[PDB]
Design an enzyme around this catalytic site. Structure first.
Site, PDB file in Angstrom:
ATOM      1  N   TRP A 150      42.240  25.406  10.834  1.00 25.79           N
ATOM      2  CA  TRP A 150      41.165  24.440  10.634  1.00 25.79           C
ATOM      3  C   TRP A 150      40.098  24.648  11.699  1.00 25.79           C
ATOM      4  O   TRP A 150      40.415  24.698  12.904  1.00 25.79           O
ATOM      5  CB  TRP A 150      41.758  23.042  10.827  1.00 25.79           C
ATOM      6  CG  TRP A 150      42.735  22.511   9.785  1.00 25.79           C
ATOM      7  CD1 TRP A 150      43.091  23.119   8.630  1.00 25.79           C
ATOM      8  CD2 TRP A 150      43.470  21.261   9.835  1.00 25.79           C
ATOM      9  NE1 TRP A 150      43.948  22.291   7.864  1.00 25.79           N
ATOM     10  CE2 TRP A 150      44.198  21.165   8.601  1.00 25.79           C
ATOM     11  CE3 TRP A 150      43.539  20.207  10.744  1.00 25.79           C
ATOM     12  CZ2 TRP A 150      44.954  20.046   8.264  1.00 25.79           C
ATOM     13  CZ3 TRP A 150      44.300  19.148  10.425  1.00 25.79           C
ATOM     14  CH2 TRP A 150      45.013  19.061   9.212  1.00 25.79           C
ATOM     15  N   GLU A 184      20.042  25.699  16.743  1.00 24.99           N
ATOM     16  CA  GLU A 184      21.381  25.987  17.255  1.00 24.99           C
ATOM     17  C   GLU A 184      21.637  25.287  18.582  1.00 24.99           C
ATOM     18  O   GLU A 184      20.771  24.625  19.234  1.00 24.99           O
ATOM     19  CB  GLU A 184      21.572  27.519  17.378  1.00 24.99           C
ATOM     20  CG  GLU A 184      21.794  28.323  16.081  1.00 24.99           C
ATOM     21  CD  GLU A 184      21.775  29.867  16.272  1.00 24.99           C
ATOM     22  OE1 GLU A 184      21.536  30.411  17.433  1.00 24.99           O
ATOM     23  OE2 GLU A 184      22.051  30.573  15.255  1.00 24.99           O
ATOM     24  N   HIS A 187      38.711  32.260  14.247  1.00 28.98           N
ATOM     25  CA  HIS A 187      39.913  32.358  13.388  1.00 28.98           C
ATOM     26  C   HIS A 187      39.595  32.445  11.918  1.00 28.98           C
ATOM     27  O   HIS A 187      40.316  33.112  11.173  1.00 28.98           O
ATOM     28  CB  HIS A 187      40.911  31.233  13.682  1.00 28.98           C
ATOM     29  CG  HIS A 187      41.541  31.376  15.066  1.00 28.98           C
ATOM     30  ND1 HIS A 187      42.188  30.346  15.748  1.00 28.98           N
ATOM     31  CD2 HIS A 187      41.720  32.492  15.829  1.00 28.98           C
ATOM     32  CE1 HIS A 187      42.702  30.875  16.856  1.00 28.98           C
ATOM     33  NE2 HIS A 187      42.386  32.149  16.967  1.00 28.98           N
TER      34      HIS A 187
HETATM   35  C1  LIG Z   1      31.406  21.197  17.268  1.00 30.25           C
HETATM   36  C2  LIG Z   1      30.876  22.414  16.571  1.00 30.25           C
HETATM   37  C3  LIG Z   1      31.542  23.655  16.544  1.00 30.25           C
HETATM   38  C4  LIG Z   1      30.985  24.762  15.902  1.00 30.25           C
HETATM   39  C5  LIG Z   1      29.784  24.625  15.144  1.00 30.25           C
HETATM   40  C6  LIG Z   1      29.028  23.393  15.202  1.00 30.25           C
HETATM   41  C7  LIG Z   1      29.700  22.225  15.831  1.00 30.25           C
HETATM   42  C8  LIG Z   1      29.021  20.875  15.876  1.00 30.25           C
HETATM   43  C9  LIG Z   1      27.916  23.377  14.187  1.00 30.25           C
HETATM   44  C10 LIG Z   1      28.449  23.519  12.740  1.00 30.25           C
HETATM   45  C11 LIG Z   1      26.999  22.213  14.335  1.00 30.25           C
HETATM   46  C12 LIG Z   1      27.102  24.632  14.585  1.00 30.25           C
HETATM   47  C13 LIG Z   1      27.879  25.672  14.114  1.00 30.25           C
HETATM   48  N1  LIG Z   1      29.175  25.760  14.523  1.00 30.25           N
HETATM   49  C14 LIG Z   1      29.919  26.974  14.449  1.00 30.25           C
HETATM   50  C15 LIG Z   1      31.127  27.078  15.170  1.00 30.25           C
HETATM   51  N2  LIG Z   1      31.840  28.215  15.201  1.00 30.25           N
HETATM   52  C16 LIG Z   1      31.427  29.267  14.495  1.00 30.25           C
HETATM   53  O1  LIG Z   1      32.015  30.252  14.449  1.00 30.25           O
HETATM   54  N3  LIG Z   1      30.367  29.194  13.746  1.00 30.25           N
HETATM   55  C17 LIG Z   1      29.563  28.147  13.728  1.00 30.25           C
HETATM   56  O2  LIG Z   1      28.655  28.251  12.972  1.00 30.25           O
HETATM   57  N4  LIG Z   1      31.634  26.036  15.980  1.00 30.25           N
HETATM   58  C18 LIG Z   1      32.493  26.373  17.124  1.00 30.25           C
HETATM   59  C19 LIG Z   1      33.978  26.417  16.655  1.00 30.25           C
HETATM   60  O3  LIG Z   1      34.297  25.268  15.906  1.00 30.25           O
HETATM   61  C20 LIG Z   1      34.959  26.595  17.755  1.00 30.25           C
HETATM   62  O4  LIG Z   1      34.637  27.865  18.288  1.00 30.25           O
HETATM   63  C21 LIG Z   1      36.423  26.603  17.265  1.00 30.25           C
HETATM   64  O5  LIG Z   1      37.268  27.062  18.321  1.00 30.25           O
HETATM   65  C22 LIG Z   1      36.689  27.415  16.032  1.00 30.25           C
HETATM   66  O6  LIG Z   1      38.140  27.218  15.713  1.00 30.25           O
HETATM   67  P1  LIG Z   1      39.123  28.453  15.736  1.00 30.25           P
HETATM   68  O7  LIG Z   1      39.529  28.524  17.185  1.00 30.25           O
HETATM   69  O8  LIG Z   1      40.273  27.905  14.956  1.00 30.25           O
HETATM   70  O9  LIG Z   1      38.509  29.709  15.205  1.00 30.25           O
HETATM   71  K   LIG Z   2      40.417  25.238  15.961  1.00 31.10           K
HETATM   72 MN   LIG Z   3      42.481  28.135  15.183  1.00 33.02          MN
END
Ligand SMILES: Cc1cc2c3c(c1C)C(C)(C)CC=[N+]3c1c([nH]c(=O)[nH]c1=O)N2C[C@H](O)[C@H](O)[C@H](O)COP(=O)(O)O
Ligand SMILES: [K+]
Ligand SMILES: [Mn+2]
Ligand SMILES: Cc1cc2c3c(c1C)C(C)(C)CC=[N+]3c1c([nH]c(=O)[nH]c1=O)N2C[C@H](O)[C@H](O)[C@H](O)COP(=O)(O)O
Ligand SMILES: [K+]
Ligand SMILES: [K+]
Ligand SMILES: [K+]
Ligand SMILES: [Mn+2]
Lengths: 500, 500
Positions: B166, B279, B188
């Site tokens: 997730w 961003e 991920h």
């Molecule tokens: C809070 C937050 C986290 C975003 C995010 C934003 C928010 C508000 C948005 C949606 C507003 C702007 C875009 N975001 C992206 C994002 N990660 C990514 O790879 N692409 C993105 O486009 N993330 C970061 C991401 O959620 C974290 O890196 C997590 O560790 C991903 O989970 P994973 O470790 O399971 O891969």
């Molecule tokens: K996560």
């Molecule tokens: Mn993860």
């Protein structure tokens, strides 16, 4: 007399402004005065005037703390500085620094000699004072001495009589009739000292004037050029010749309305223990005493009910940040422009403990230069870091026209998002360093050399075709009519004054 | 249902807290909702709930802006985050991050399957929805699409069924039944995607759940380890198994109380135009569109009166700072400790636009290592910058035990006064870089590599014999009894509440 030309009138101005607290009960100069002052400076409170200082005898002395520190409101944040210069209390930093630079392309207005003034109301000769008996403050608990001199003006003159310099360098009491202090390169008191030592004939005639005209203390804290007599610069800045009286035991001239004046000599041979002292960068190193310059005091003159100004310096925010940083930054802005660099504004961010200067670039001018980051960074650093006005500054941050360099948050934003560490920076190791920064004099490398950097927070297209982004902020990422609709409906919808 | 386990209850919590403004008059999802939200985030105001969104049809949808943004008071600054986690609203950052790390040495509590839930109150099949007809917001005026996905949870599963991830990755509407978005290494969703593409047989079964349990969105935004199913981590963190329902058109499981659920596939072959987008670092580059991943939507399910959360991200302060920065910093703190590095705390300063992490060092432990700055900087950088949890961070600042890393002012002070530029730093050019930082993807060097640095703000004696200074501040440069005297007499003398 006007507040910018007379310290006593400046104190009255601060009262009228509701920017003064008069403490009339007994206050200890051993720490207590400086502790109250310290708290004032860390909270931007009203300046303290200690009218009942334990140990005050025969008129010496009251203390005014925090004379060039910040006010709480945004609207008159720099009001105490404005009051040094006849500016409205709402003056911006840009307006204060422009006023400090304004004399740089004006003819000097040399001082006027008058036969007497308030600084001659009382005197003490060589058999009547003892500097260990006056209420000199212990400012920080680990200081190596009682620092009588944190906001007075040293006056020394070149052997040929052609340049008289006024500057703030720290000094502390050594014994009944001497002080020790810092006299270090590249400072003008040091440059003049060197001239006298190479002549080798006599110690340097000297005076130290406390409670001088506020416009004169400002110029004393600004690195105006080598050879330029601060009195004539202040004269031009203020549009009025300053009135000076002659010292009684030497031929130097002091402001007529000085609160307290010491007359004597700066030795060309003797030294004595000096420091440590709680310093501008926020630290003291207990027990770090080294030999400093030695001054002999032959005479004291003073106003009735004399007031000593004091800087309780350290962590944010005091005179060492608002005056040393900002005035260096003003001189650096001018210096860059005189070297044909397209700099519009300069400021030393408080958040950098005034160790950085942010330089705002006219990027239309930059574009016409048809240059690169590496070349431009090198050119800027070579100009600033090889000059005395760059002494205290270890990092220069170059920013484009969208950034307000007087706003630390915007400088920090630009630095953190537009300067790629390493690649967008040039290090300078073969320039004079500022040893008082902890990472210099108590660090891993040479205390007096290097440790400087130019960080380019200009984006690539700012050298070529123009800014190629819009900020993701309320100002830039929504049209005007929508923004205004939002603001006009804000309190109506449920959401939340300039003076506060 | 409790607020940390049910988004609808979380909205009610914010109302009860007087931390919500309900706007019941018509608001345009074309910019206006996001403009109000942007202003809220730049001023730390109350979260907006747009109950009358122009274009809302058949229950889709209301918007909640600023769900993880800051409150105005210092006392409950992080209250909205605390409300994601069942913590008191006065919780510190340290307590929030400790709660997010607490499941890292607990057995997972896997989810419980239930046969239905509120997310099944309404459905739309393949002939009944059109994503271009919903009130999807245009968040910034130059965005390349309408970003439906700024605060929902993507759900994808490894081909072998063993890991269900997730995560929040952005996505925007491409056409009536597809989205495009970022799917980039080392994330991920990207790692799982790669597994499906190497198998080569089918597109990735996918769901996107908006308005999920607040504790689950927090874990979705935290870089917990490879292979770890976020559901079981949240279960352990909260002490309760999460209730999930099966999707109707695939075998993935979504939170039962999800406000809105999209079901479909992430393609292993197709791409489409994606971005630009305003961003986290505060910028948009208009016209900077590139091919992104392409999702197909086959089904929508949703709660009656569904609410879509939205992040109007950009300049300080929003979910991209409070969640991406702080949660990365928590994982980095753990990672350092598991590599036997003496780190006690970590935080990504807001002032660095969450591009720095400050690492507080136990200097007693450091001293026993009998090491040097160069060696220690290299060891810390190699651990963090070669790990996924370090992806977004370009500067690590090492500080001793006197600094509170959760206080940007103190981090800035330490950095500026204790780290000698160049000499006290190690640059890392052969590590993965974060291309979204402007100086990376729009800068002078490779967008995906390098640009990272470890800045050592430990002083020399902190490696050897111990701190050798006292701060020149009210706390450290005056004795206790004097300090207390000053404070007890402060208002009496004339000078100037915790909740406010
Ligand atoms: C809070 C937050 C986290 C975003 C995010 C934003 C928010 C508000 C948005 C949606 C507003 C702007 C875009 N975001 C992206 C994002 N990660 C990514 O790879 N692409 C993105 O486009 N993330 C970061 C991401 O959620 C974290 O890196 C997590 O560790 C991903 O989970 P994973 O470790 O399971 O891969
Ligand atoms: K996560
Ligand atoms: Mn993860
Ligand atoms: C405002 C300010 C300026 C201090 C100063 C302080 C204050 C409050 C103190 C007294 C509180 C701490 C110590 N100070 C020293 C000092 N310069 C220096 O060489 N030695 C010092 O010890 N300066 C900086 C100095 O005044 C500027 O560098 C001037 O440019 C010197 O003038 P010059 O250009 O004519 O040499
Ligand atoms: K001067
Ligand atoms: K740059
Ligand atoms: K260091
Ligand atoms: Mn000078």
């Amino acid at each position: 007399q006007p507040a910018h030309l007379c310290f006593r009138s400046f104190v009255e101005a601060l009262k009228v402004d509701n920017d003064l607290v008069e403490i009339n009960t007994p206050i200890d100069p051993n720490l207590e005065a400086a502790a109250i002052t310290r708290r004032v400076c860390e909270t931007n409170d009203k300046a303290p005037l200690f009218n009942n200082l334990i140990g005050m005898k025969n008129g010496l002395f009251r203390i005014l703390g925090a004379p060039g520190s910040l006010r709480k409101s945004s609207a008159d944040r720099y009001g105490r500085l404005a009051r040094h210069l006849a500016l409205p209390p709402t003056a911006s930093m840009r307006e204060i620094l422009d006023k400090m630079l304004s004399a740089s392309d004006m003819p000097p207005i040399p001082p006027t000699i008058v036969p007497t003034g308030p600084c001659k109301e009382n005197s003490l000769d060589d058999s009547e004072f003892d500097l260990t008996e006056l209420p000199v403050p212990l400012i920080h608990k680990s200081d190596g001495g009682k620092y009588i001199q944190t906001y007075g003006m040293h006056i020394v003159q070149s052997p040929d009589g052609t340049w008289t310099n006024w500057s703030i360098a720290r000094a502390m009491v050594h014994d009944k009739n001497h002080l020790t202090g810092l006299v270090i390169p590249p400072q003008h008191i040091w440059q003049i000292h060197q001239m006298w030592k190479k002549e080798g004939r006599s110690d340097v005639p000297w005076a130290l004037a406390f409670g001088v005209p506020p416009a004169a203390i400002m110029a004393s804290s600004m690195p105006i050029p080598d050879g330029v007599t601060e009195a004539g610069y202040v004269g031009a800045m203020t549009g009025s010749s300053l009135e000076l009286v002659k010292c009684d035991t030497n031929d130097l001239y002091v402001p007529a309305t000085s609160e307290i004046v010491l007359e004597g000599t700066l030795s060309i041979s003797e030294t004595g223990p000096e420091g440590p002292f709680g310093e501008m960068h926020g630290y003291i190193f207990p027990g770090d005493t080294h030999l400093g310059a030695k001054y002999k005091v032959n005479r004291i003159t003073y106003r009735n009910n004399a007031i000593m100004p004091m800087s309780s310096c350290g962590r944010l925010t005091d005179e060492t940040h608002t005056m040393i940083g900002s005035l260096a930054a003003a001189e650096i802005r001018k210096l860059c422009q005189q070297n044909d660099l397209p700099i519009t504004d300069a400021f030393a961010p408080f958040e950098s403990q005034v160790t950085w200067v942010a330089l705002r670039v006219d990027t239309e001018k930059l574009r016409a230069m048809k240059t690169t980051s590496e070349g431009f960074r090198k050119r800027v650093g070579d100009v600033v870091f090889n000059h005395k006005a760059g002494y205290t500054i270890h990092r220069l941050v170059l920013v484009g026209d969208d950034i307000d360099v007087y706003e630390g948050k915007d400088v920090l934003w630009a630095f953190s998002t537009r300067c790629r560490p390493g690649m967008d920076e040039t290090l300078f190791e073969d320039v004079r360093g500022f040893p008082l920064i902890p990472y210099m004099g108590h660090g891993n490398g040479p205390a007096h050399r290097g440790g400087k950097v130019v960080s380019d927070a200009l984006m690539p297209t700012e050298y070529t075709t123009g800014r190629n982004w819009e900020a993701a902020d309320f100002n830039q990422s929504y049209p005007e009519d929508l923004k205004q609709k939002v603001l006009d409906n804000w309190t109506k919808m449920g959401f939340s004054h300039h003076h506060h």
